[PDB]
Design an enzyme around this catalytic site. Sequence first.
Site, PDB file in Angstrom:
ATOM      1  N   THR A 159      -0.777  18.683   1.379  1.00 24.45           N
ATOM      2  CA  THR A 159       0.599  18.218   1.339  1.00 24.45           C
ATOM      3  C   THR A 159       1.514  19.167   0.546  1.00 24.45           C
ATOM      4  O   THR A 159       2.428  19.585   1.167  1.00 24.45           O
ATOM      5  CB  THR A 159       0.894  16.645   1.410  1.00 24.45           C
ATOM      6  OG1 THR A 159       0.040  16.072   2.183  1.00 24.45           O
ATOM      7  CG2 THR A 159       2.243  16.217   1.530  1.00 24.45           C
ATOM      8  N   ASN A 180      -3.539  19.746  -4.022  1.00 28.71           N
ATOM      9  CA  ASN A 180      -2.587  18.720  -4.665  1.00 28.71           C
ATOM     10  C   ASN A 180      -3.276  18.349  -5.831  1.00 28.71           C
ATOM     11  O   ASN A 180      -2.507  17.465  -6.754  1.00 28.71           O
ATOM     12  CB  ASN A 180      -3.177  17.372  -3.596  1.00 28.71           C
ATOM     13  CG  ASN A 180      -2.269  17.572  -2.236  1.00 28.71           C
ATOM     14  OD1 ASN A 180      -1.359  18.252  -2.405  1.00 28.71           O
ATOM     15  ND2 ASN A 180      -2.865  16.651  -1.323  1.00 28.71           N
ATOM     16  N   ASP A 683      -8.845  46.630  -2.240  1.00 27.38           N
ATOM     17  CA  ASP A 683      -8.084  45.462  -2.987  1.00 27.38           C
ATOM     18  C   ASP A 683      -9.085  44.842  -3.575  1.00 27.38           C
ATOM     19  O   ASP A 683      -9.570  43.743  -3.704  1.00 27.38           O
ATOM     20  CB  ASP A 683      -7.689  44.304  -1.729  1.00 27.38           C
ATOM     21  CG  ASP A 683      -6.826  43.612  -2.256  1.00 27.38           C
ATOM     22  OD1 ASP A 683      -6.068  43.769  -3.457  1.00 27.38           O
ATOM     23  OD2 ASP A 683      -6.379  42.446  -1.953  1.00 27.38           O
TER      24      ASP A 683
HETATM   25 CA   LIG Z   1      -5.038  45.376  -4.767  1.00 28.42          CA
HETATM   26 ZN   LIG Z   2      -2.569  13.147   3.995  1.00 26.43          ZN
END
Ligand SMILES: [Ca+2]
Ligand SMILES: [Zn+2]
Length: 804
Positions: A159, A180, A683
């Site tokens: 949420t 959360n 990366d």
């Molecule tokens: Ca990077």
């Molecule tokens: Zn929920």
Amino acid sequence: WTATSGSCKGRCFELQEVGPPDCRCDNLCKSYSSCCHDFDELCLKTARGWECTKDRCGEVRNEENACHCSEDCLSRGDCCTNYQVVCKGESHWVDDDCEEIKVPECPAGFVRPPLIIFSVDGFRASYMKKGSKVMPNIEKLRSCGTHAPYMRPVYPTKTFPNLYTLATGLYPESHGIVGNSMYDPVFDASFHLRGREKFNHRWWGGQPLWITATKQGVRAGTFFWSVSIPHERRILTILQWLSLPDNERPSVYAFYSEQPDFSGHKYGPFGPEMTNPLREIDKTVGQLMDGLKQLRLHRCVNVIFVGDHGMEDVTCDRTEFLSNYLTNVDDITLVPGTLGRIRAKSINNSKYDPKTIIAALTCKKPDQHFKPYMKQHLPKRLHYANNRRIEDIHLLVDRRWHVARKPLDVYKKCFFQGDHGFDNKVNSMQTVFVGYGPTFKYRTKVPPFENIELYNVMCDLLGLKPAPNNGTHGSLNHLLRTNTFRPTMPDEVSRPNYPGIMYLQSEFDLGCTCDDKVENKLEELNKRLHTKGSTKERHLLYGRPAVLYRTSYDILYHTDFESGYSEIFLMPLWTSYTISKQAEVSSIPEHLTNCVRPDVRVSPGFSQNCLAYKNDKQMSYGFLFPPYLSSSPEAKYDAFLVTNMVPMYPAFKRVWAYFQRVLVKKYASERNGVNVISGPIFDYNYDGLRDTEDEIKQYVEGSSIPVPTHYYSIITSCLDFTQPADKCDGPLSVSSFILPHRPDNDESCNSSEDESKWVEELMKMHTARVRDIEHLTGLDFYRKTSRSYSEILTLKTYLHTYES
Ligand SMILES: [Ca+2]
Ligand SMILES: [Zn+2]
Ligand SMILES: *[C@@H]1O[C@H](CO)[C@@H](O[C@@H]2O[C@H](CO)[C@@H](O[C@@H]3O[C@H](CO[C@H]4O[C@H](CO)[C@@H](O)[C@H](O[C@H]5O[C@H](CO)[C@@H](O)[C@H](O)[C@@H]5O[C@H]5O[C@H](CO)[C@@H](O)[C@H](O)[C@@H]5O)[C@@H]4O)[C@@H](O)[C@H](O[C@H]4O[C@H](CO)[C@@H](O)[C@H](O)[C@@H]4O[C@H]4O[C@H](CO)[C@@H](O)[C@H](O)[C@@H]4O)[C@@H]3O)[C@H](O)[C@H]2NC(C)=O)[C@H](O)[C@H]1NC(C)=O
Ligand SMILES: O=C(/C=C/c1ccc(OC(F)(F)F)cc1)N1CC[C@@H]2CN(C(=O)[C@@H]3CCc4[nH]nnc4C3)C[C@@H]2CC1
Ligand code: NA
């Protein structure tokens, strides 16, 4: 301490923040326990309910009433939302035919159409069709406005990460709300759903829409609502704010509903108990639209109906327990549920080892319902790694399942039938988008898109400049009748060299060999034409990618493929080639198995060498343009150039060879030709962005050849597959992947089997947008097509999901 002795008289739901210890009267004061003593009496009136009835019509104003049916109520801006229907013979908004809103029709004194965001928690995308019979107001918004069949949330499909991604345009790794529940090791502090740590401004990063509006002089309603404030009262408060004098009136507002999430957790996404919460939401929508109609605002306001995430069937009996895998379960802390995050229980424990934990969790049970990952190895499409609050070890949980530490966590903490949080491509996690109003299109369906894109559009709807975010601004212009944002293509930063033949064979001392010394003005002028770009229109279909950073690179042409070869990384940044439906697959001839050939256009000093691969016992090599797809025996020699070679672990070569030998041809068959652009990605700091040379953590042993973290491919064809990829008149179709370049196939539990039983499944998990590749490479694709730039931006955000 709050001096709760102040009063809310004339201050109910005031917009200004009021600081401690003076008492509060705003829509969140309840959640902070800071309301003035008389907030309930004055600001949360309930007397007589929320609806006018015939006998209240014309009544004498009684200020105790929740809402009014007296003659003065329109001027006071506080009628019950049904006043004009009951007392003045008007229709409900839902009963009126829809009529195109070609221009805004706003009352005098309105400087712009207001924006109202109606946000719904747990509103699964399929509710739009499956509950349509019980949601007539929402169905009218959907059918008369602009809608998507679904909107993709961000991972984790929880949420607070998704509501805050809606508000900011950012991935949770960037805005900082990565769950959360969180632990920040630098603050040494825990964030929870319940309690006071979450109110600390240090958790929330980026710049949410209400702050963007306020800094640019557009006034904002307070977006958030304490749970005990009934929805009817939320609606009445918004409508009351809309009757404020011009200089005081906000231009952007939010409503929030805890439903259907609340009941969905209890009853599952399609439990028969779920009809009533959908009816109730729809009635709230009807209240708002009726109230807007009363204010003569129903053809002025832009309304967005938007959810955070869906809901899946999940019960207590479908929980995996780490105590069934780990010897040392008490040495770890687990964040549990529909995702897992693991870290050491104590920082003073020198016998903690992430490697032994990952190994003990990897392919241990045949039906195992979660998969462990170091966070850097998670599918890059999740963008879930670059934040100190995301633990190094992550468990991706199968839909319909939970993970927990020990069985006692489940019963001594079934309670529930629904949950969410899973991988954001899962169909049950998809959620809703509808826009309705003068600025949105009329009766228009748009393809699914990602919630990171909405902030830009909400800024556009309000005339605001968006803060830097992860949307691609212009990619959603097709949702809008006007206020489009017309982006220009980035300027190329580095221009390529076009080397001709400049080196003799004997200048190279690469330790490579090739049985190629076998041999005509006829065919020679021809092969010279190929090296100068004569076939380039066939293989480079959408223009050369633009290099958007400072570097030194060469364009290299060949019969079957074109490449941009980096002199810095000693390998191509990109390799582009087209495979028609008619193309034939061939083998690598026995005399060419180990062939690598010096490239006479590129100096020895800017080439790889075969000796480094011989000496590196862990590293082998592969090729970007595949020798299997050579147009002819003679052209096949180009595929063994040293400038087409890339470093690959033997385990990864199993994946790459099957993709190149089997899958590309399959795709060309199915799609009527494909254009492929492949290349390496680096990366090492897992930030989703192209590494600079000084960020590279691993080289082929003894050399300056950098090892990619990932290999990508972008596979484009004609949306109308009755036309071949290389002669396409209209829109394009694309799918892409970013495959992790790993030295084992431990991610694929079935990898000891034939590649036909596991490789394509791996690739599907690592599906990507072209835009993800752009960030990771600093390249800009599709620079020369006959399509509008906004349509191309939408194409670059497309994600091929392989859900049915
Ligand atoms: Ca990077
Ligand atoms: Zn929920
Ligand atoms: C999605 O979109 C977003 C937004 O566009 C993208 O994020 C941007 O990426 C940039 C590059 O990574 C980054 O730019 C850096 O800004 C640094 C200053 O940052 C502060 O100020 C900004 C502006 O107000 C603010 O937004 C930042 O907020 C972050 O940090 C706080 C925590 O303190 C959080 O509350 C907040 O959520 C956010 O955190 C996120 O980003 C940070 C990185 O900034 C991560 O660490 C977090 O995990 C989290 O994801 C900041 O308060 C600036 O200092 C940087 O400059 C360095 O590098 C340049 C090279 O050009 C150089 O000039 C400098 O020398 C400097 O290096 C020095 O620091 C090094 C590290 O300590 C050190 O080793 C060196 O020796 C040097 O001393 C840099 O320009 C920008 O902050 C973010 N913006 C946001 C909002 O996150 C994101 O990339 C997109 N994602 C994808 C995949 O496309
Ligand atoms: O009413 C809402 C949600 C409204 C909403 C509307 C639109 C939207 O999407 C959009 F942005 F795009 F519009 C996203 C959310 N909620 C959900 C969010 C939390 C916040 N909260 C706090 O207590 C906050 C915690 C964090 C915080 N920091 N300072 N004040 C606060 C209040 C309890 C709880 C209140 C009820
Ligand atoms: Na395996």
